[PDB]
């Protein structure tokens, strides 16, 4: 018969299958729609998640209960070393979809991006792109000019290839991350000129994004392995000492068809899924060369974004960093893709101006109450090892 008391489904069918992601680096499924009257710009970037911290923000939100008051908010720090552009990929439109037509690479490629093409870089002869580097020299780059004009003549979507400088991060990985970033705005010839002018040049994060802008974060979430139905889907636990498991679903079926349905909660892989989260506000784009990039106009303490004793399981941030309000999918040390919003925003929160008053730099390795080592030294006073 019918179900006596109605209840909504556990979990969403929009995120099936709950399998592991096919690739560690997040995939930009869709780019913002291209307007040829707009100026040329890049639409995405990558960074690495350092960790989280606490801020105090002077809120300017008219009509809110916390208007003209101080709010405490959680933010995420993403270390963003500059990206090097080493390629240009052309796309054409076919009745089967977008198709890549050709790819033009730069003359000189770093060992960081050359490691990406190899699984055993230490045993290799490192021969990658060696014959390709000679077509810049033979016939004055006639083949390079031919492919570039092929992109200018036949292609409609132009994407640069950009790789991260992972050597500036505290990660033990030396293999860099390479991705396609779509050039939006202008004509196709303008895009190709823009890309060739950007070969072999480092691009920083502040030339792609700006403070107070809402972006999207694409990554792979924290993996949990094989997890049962109670934590995987949120089903109600069976009573105590239920025979054959109580952290289970009592009925995986009581009705026709004589099958198990795809909508029934089953134990399996939980976490390590590919997720795209939208509407994340950028609160601060701090510069690596600044020695006071975690100091506000009211907090005059000259200090950096790195917490006291460093980030837990990441290290110390010494490059340009992005502070994002809230949380992002992924773990520490994980590659993150920051993307422009696909649509014009419809909220006043995306038009608000963020005025930070304090950033927490205390230790996340415990109940740290000091923001700098000098503060701890002044509070504790003189110790035995000082006279020793």
């Amino acid at each position: 018969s019918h179900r006596k008391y109605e209840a909504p489904r556990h979990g969403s069918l929009a995120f099936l299958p709950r399998k592991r992601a096919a690739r560690h680096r997040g995939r930009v499924k869709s780019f913002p729609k291209d307007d040829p009257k707009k100026p040329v710009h890049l639409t995405a970037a990558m960074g690495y998640k350092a960790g989280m911290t606490t801020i105090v923000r002077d809120l300017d939100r008219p009509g809110a209960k916390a208007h003209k008051k101080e709010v405490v908010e959680a933010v995420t720090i993403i270390d963003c070393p500059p990206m090097v552009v080493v390629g240009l990929v052309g796309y054409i439109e076919t009745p089967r979809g977008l198709r890549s037509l050709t790819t033009v690479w730069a003359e000189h490629l770093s060992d960081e991006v050359k490691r990406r093409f190899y699984k055993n870089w230490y045993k290799s002869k490192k021969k990658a792109f060696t014959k390709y580097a000679k077509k810049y020299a033979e016939n004055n780059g006639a083949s390079i000019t031919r492919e570039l004009e092929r992109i200018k003549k036949y292609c409609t979507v132009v994407r640069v290839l950009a790789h991260t400088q992972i050597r500036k991060t505290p990660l033990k990985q030396k293999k860099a991350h390479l991705m396609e970033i779509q050039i939006n705005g202008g004509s196709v010839a303008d895009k190709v000129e823009f890309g060739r002018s950007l070969f072999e040049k480092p691009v920083t994060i502040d030339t792609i994004f700006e403070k107070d802008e809402m972006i999207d974060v694409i990554a792979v979430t924290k993996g949990h392995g094989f997890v049962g139905v109670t934590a995987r889907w949120g089903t109600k636990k069976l009573p105590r000492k239920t025979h054959k498991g109580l952290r289970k679903v009592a009925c995986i079926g009581a009705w026709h068809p004589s099958h198990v349905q795809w909508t029934v909660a089953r134990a399996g892989q939980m976490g390590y899924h590919h997720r795209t989260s939208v509407n994340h506000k950028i609160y601060r784009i701090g510069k690596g060369d600044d020695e006071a990039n975690a100091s506000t106009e009211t907090d005059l303490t000259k200090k950096k974004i790195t917490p006291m004793g460093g980030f837990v399981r990441y290290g110390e941030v010494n490059n340009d960093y992005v502070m994002i309000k809230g949380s992002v999918p992924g773990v520490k040390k994980r590659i993150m893709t920051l993307r422009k919003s696909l649509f014009t925003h419809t909220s006043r929160k995306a038009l608000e101006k963020v005025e930070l008053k304090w950033i927490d730099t205390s230790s996340e390795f415990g109940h740290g109450a000091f923001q700098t080592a000098a503060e701890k030294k002044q509070f504790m006073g003189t110790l035995k090892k000082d006279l020793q």
């Binding site: 300017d60 008219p62 009509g63 003209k68 106009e297 009211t298 907090d299 005059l300 303490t301 006043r348 008053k357 304090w358 000091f370 923001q371 700098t372 000098a374 503060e375 002044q378 509070f379």
Partner: protein, 51 residues
């Protein structure tokens, strides 16, 4: 507020009616935290004589 957006859009300026010796200080960012200490705790009119 009705000419500048309406209720919930117009942002009021709370420093417009401040009475200061110099009107150029009307929109300064008053420091609060310095080296892990409160500035308002050290604010004193006789701070020069005490120093």
């Amino acid at each position: 507020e009705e000419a500048n957006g309406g209720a919930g859009v117009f942002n009021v300026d709370l420093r417009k009616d401040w009475i200061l010796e110099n009107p150029e200080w009307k929109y300064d960012k008053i420091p609060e935290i310095f080296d892990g200490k409160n500035v308002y705790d050290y604010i004193d009119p006789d701070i020069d004589a005490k120093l």
